[PDB]
Amino acid sequence: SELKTTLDAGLLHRGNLLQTIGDQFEQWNLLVKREKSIYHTLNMLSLDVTKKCLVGEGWSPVFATKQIQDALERAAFDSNSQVGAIFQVLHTKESPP
Amino acid sequence: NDADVSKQIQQMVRFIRQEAEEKANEISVSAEEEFNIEKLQLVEAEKKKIRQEYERK
Amino acid sequence: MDHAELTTEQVLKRDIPWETYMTTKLISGTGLQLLRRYDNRSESHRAQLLDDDGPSYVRVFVSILRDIYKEETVEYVLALIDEMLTANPKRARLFHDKSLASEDTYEPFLRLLWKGNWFIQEKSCKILASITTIDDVLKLLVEWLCAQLKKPSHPSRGVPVAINCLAALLKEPMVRSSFVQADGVKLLTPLISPASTQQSIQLLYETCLCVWLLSYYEPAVEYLATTRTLPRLIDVVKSSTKEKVVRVVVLILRNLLPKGNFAAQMIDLGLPQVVQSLKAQAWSDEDLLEGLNQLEEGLKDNIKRLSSFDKYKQEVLLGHLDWSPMHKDPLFWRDNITNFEENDFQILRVLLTILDTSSDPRALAVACFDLSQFIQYHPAGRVIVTDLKAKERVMKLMNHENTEVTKSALLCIQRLFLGAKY
Amino acid sequence: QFKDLNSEKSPFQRTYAAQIKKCAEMARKLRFFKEQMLKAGILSDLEVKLGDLEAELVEINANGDKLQRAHSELVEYKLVLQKA
Amino acid sequence: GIQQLLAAEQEAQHIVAAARNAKMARLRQAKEEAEREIAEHRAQVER
């Protein structure tokens, strides 16, 4: 009886913590999704050691690409780094879907 | 280019100044301090030996 | 530096009529002409003027310009003269002559220190350029920083001039001792790395160089031991992702890592954090890797010393309890109990009493975790805990708040019930 | 969307594939915690804390199961002795 | 453009090499300087 009571108390405490643990994990679903997306993007990309800035070439909406300056400025201000990345478009034979 | 190339060249120049000069001068100062302190300790040991010889004399 | 160049341009763009001032008796006619020549030494060397080539004549113009201490006039004169002297054609050997001659150094003193902030910033290049008592005198509790910073900002409006002056003072050991005598060094330590600023990287790097220089000097080492928020500055640098500033801070910490049991323990707390940051954030500089290895070695050395404290029950003796690494290890916990058991578990009895009633909530949870680990490692620990009745209090705390302490208390109750269960 | 130049060059350690492997370990821990929560039925640095909490819950469950087994053994002994 | 960045990297490498050479030279010179200082101190002791 004593062992059963102790086990029941332990299980109750575990569940009481596990409710908030599950809520945190539910948030952690989106958190891990974002982290994995960032990691995959970094792995796909190839950084430039000479410029000390990661080199990124991707298929973006050329018309909508004008707004990339907003995201770049937001990243620069949040990071507060004085160094500012430059975004450019390079003409090529390959057709972006 | 235009503002972008100006920003890039300014970033390169600022890198050359800050990142290169800071590590270089810090290494120089620290190495000079460590070397002169260690050799001053060696000179102090030699001076202690010379003082022992002078005491014997 | 970009700020110094911008301040020099802000002074050189505006013109000042030297002839009108000479006619108005503000400056001597020859003196005003020499000031104008020092300002336009770039064009004079472009014209291959004899004065520009002549180091002494250029030195004479520099001294005449430095004699005046007005904000705008001396600002323009000093900025343009320094810009020209930077160029090889203008005032090349004049810098060496000025360094050799004490008269030129004395003349820049008036333009520096008590003068306009723009004038101080413009003459700061020549002043910092070593190639004396007055230079040592120029450092105080307020010094020229109060004018250089946003306070009395004027045209230059740059605290970075004050930061560069501090770095130059740190360069010279005599100037380092003089600045150590001056107040505000410890206060500057709290704000070594600017948390969020446009010039945060520059200010942080300059302060990191100053910290490395202080680590080089023994009296500065004592001042750092007496400095305020130095650990806070280290933690801020750890928060910062500026790899250059991070490497500089790591080098400064490595140079400043003394035996210092307390500072060593604090670093060991950051040393695992430093290793974690190095693993998570890869640093290009190999110096960063060397500093990380040194920090790991220092953490190991601190753990070696901390092991003796854990066995001797230093936390119990001091009255404050924290989660001991030896407590988390069943073998180390058993060894610590045996050291206590050498006195018939007297230190273990004190630990059990602290578990029953502790100074801080963290102390109670740490004591409960240590008791659970010891009970698992040694049957006598569970019996001692039950006799002290701290087991019931821990079990009650398990249903209480502090969910981390609640989990630790649940672990302790499980450890007790393992023996209790048939 | 950037092309996978680094992966094509080398899948092993790529450019930041060490960070990718760390994120993969974190995601595996998150998946294990999510599976445990789904079994539990809960509503579903930080990764280390989540792993520690999951390990604590698993340890509590295992201790409870061991205590239940011990209670069953003691009930067996009690029943046998009472019958005797 | 990119060649400017390459020249920047080359200049940074040159600065690093200069710093290393300066550290080595400073150590080498400090050795002889402190040896001479110790000799002078021994001379005053002899006096």
Side-chain angles (χ1 to χ4, degrees), chain A residues 9-10 15 22 56 58 61 64 71 75-76 84-85 96-97, chain B residues 3 5 9 11 16 20 23-25 27-31 36-37 39 45, chain C residues 4 17 29 31 47 54-55 79 87 89 92 101 108 116 129 132 147 152 155 158 160 162 167-168 173 182 184 190 194-195 219-220 225 231 258 260 263-264 270 272 280 282 291 298 319 325 330 361 363 365 367 379-381 390 409 419-420, chain D residues 11 17-18 24 27 40-41 51 55 62 64 70 84, chain E residues 1 7-8 12 15 17-19 22 25 30 34 39 41 43-44:
Chain B
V5 65
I9 63 170
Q11 188 270 331
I16 295 174
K23 72 179 192 293
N25 69 16
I27 287 168
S28 65
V29 164
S30 49
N36 72 19
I37 278 160
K39 189 61 181 176
Chain C
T132 189
Chain E
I15 293 170
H41 155 65
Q44 284 103 27

